[PDB]
């Protein structure tokens, strides 16, 4: 699930979690949104909602990185931001 968010003066307008020691979900060290601010990029978009995981962002994978990388990649937005979200399914 990809979403083409346009970088605005305000910013992202939400929060995230990610990585060992700072994981958002047990068993998954991916980057998940923990709190979306009103009138924010995600909030306004509607596609991104609490519980989603960040597969990749700007060509980089956000599923095997620490929290620093989760924030560094979310903050690494120039004109546009290509967010890649993975669909949670699992086998077990």
């Amino acid at each position: 699930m990809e979403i083409k968010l346009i970088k605005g003066p305000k910013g992202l307008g939400f929060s995230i979690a990610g990585g060992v020691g700072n994981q958002h979900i047990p068993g998954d060290n991916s980057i998940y949104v923990t709190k979306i601010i009103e009138g924010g990029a995600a909030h306004k978009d509607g596609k991104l909602q609490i519980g989603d995981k960040l597969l990749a962002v700007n060509n980089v994978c956000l599923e095997e990185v620490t929290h620093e990388e989760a924030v560094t990649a979310l903050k690494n937005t120039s004109d546009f931001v290509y967010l890649k979200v993975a669909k949670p399914t699992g086998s077990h």
Partner: peptide, 6 residues
């Protein structure tokens, strides 16, 4: 666990 805003 750590949750930071961005």
């Amino acid at each position: 666990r750590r949750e930071t805003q961005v």
